[PDB]
Amino acid sequence: SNNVKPQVFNPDNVMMHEKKDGTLMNEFTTPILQEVMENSKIMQLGKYEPMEGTEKKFTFWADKPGAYWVGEGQKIETSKATWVNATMRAFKLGVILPVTKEFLNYTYSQFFEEMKPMIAEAFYKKFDEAGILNQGNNPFGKSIAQSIEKTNKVIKGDFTQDNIIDLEALLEDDELEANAFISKTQNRSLLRKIVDPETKERIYDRNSDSLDGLPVVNLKSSNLKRGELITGDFDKLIYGIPQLIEYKIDETAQLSTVKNEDGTPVNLFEQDMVALRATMHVALHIADDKAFAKLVPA
Amino acid sequence: MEGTEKKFTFWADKPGAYWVGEGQKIETSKATWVNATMRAFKLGVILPVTKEFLNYTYSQFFEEMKPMIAEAFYKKFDEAGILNQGNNPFGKSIAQSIEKTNKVIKGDFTQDNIIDLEALLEDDELEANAFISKTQNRSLLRKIVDPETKERIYDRNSDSLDGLPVVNLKSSNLKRGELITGDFDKLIYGIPQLI
Amino acid sequence: SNNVKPQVFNPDNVMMHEKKDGTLMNEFTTPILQEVMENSKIMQLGKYEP
């Protein structure tokens, strides 16, 4: 054939040195980032739990023995202890980034080293929005938002010291104490304008991002609406990581998920291409479905 | 700037990620970047003088006019880039961007409206940095009071509103009822040639 | 997609860590052979030829 025009791909996920209009992309000015990389908020709030396999077992006390009053020479009676069990399993995150090897020579030599940070953020966000918000095809049967929905442990109404005290009070009604708040940064407008009419002191630190003395953590997600606030005992949210992010770089595989213009699968050896594969195994457990409560606009 | 134009490359998309079953196919995703560019324009004026005037009437005229020419340029630049006035040459200004994104409040000066006006930036994960004001707003700004605590948000001692600096335009185009908020690290200015 | 249930295969010769009912095979015990493996009878009886 000796067809020298560049290859069209579907989807257009391949990075390329040459465009189909004939533009050839030398002297490329390396992009810069208007942002800082986000952490996992679950790895921030929750409790880490070492986990060697893809599954883990927990056992807890449930009943404690009694005692009796006995007269001299009366028969002493018996009593019984009891325990209960819980379990969590892991799921796998992954992505592939394909590159034409001209691109990696004549346009952006460092490309994969600059993607490695940006891949981690993508995994962390996928994990947080599953485990906090029940979003993004949550693989676990478990989340904060789903715990709240099964307990119906929800407050309705406006951000007020009235409703914010009631929100935390809803946890000690189950003999738990709140440890943090989850909110959407859009809504510190509302927290900034509530004050006690009696003592005339404000509940929210604009300076420290503390609400009612507890720390506030902000989600970047769009799924948590402005009027909504969540609180809980986050030591009851347990996570594990059987496999820290592993990267493989591959110069010879076939990618079936990207197709050539003629419909053939992309072959990395035969078409002179490279790809990066990242995978991570991550596990989530809500230790107590009652430990979380939500305030919602009516 | 090292010439009359500047150019910037910024990342525009992060790569996705997928939940993958046991032995299921992993899917692909891409990064992306976007380009922006900034160009200069020229300001100028000429001041003609009769030689008799410069000899007999006012010898230092040009040395003393230089400061006033400089001020005339700054007031032309500001009125083009803050407002959209003075037959603005550039593609866009703040008042252009506010009409396009429609981040405007209709209302009187109240603590609620001053807080909502900043909340219009928190909508988009941006934090307000300063205010731009008419100086004849000070009659309105000083009578804003918190009804519970009776705190006043305009610090008379520091020309500071809600703890943010206010900066005053001295132009006829910004009306007695109007106030502007932003993150001014997003204004970029360059000067290829000083006066 | 984000489809998390395990991959079905045909002929189904692939070894997998989890079953389609969701049983993850953690804490698995290494099998032990019931008989003992057979040698080649040809290699026992025949003449070798380098």
Next chain:
Amino acid sequence: EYKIDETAQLSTVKNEDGTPVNLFEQDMVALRATMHVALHIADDKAFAKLVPA
């Protein structure tokens, strides 16, 4: 001889939709074993058999 491979395609095993199994996309491993072996019968008369009627 044993060769272990982490990236090749297998064509003889197919996914639920009928696609071949790509070991790289699907995060898999395969062991290939091969051997060469040869046979000769120096005299075909040297063997005899008893068979039921």
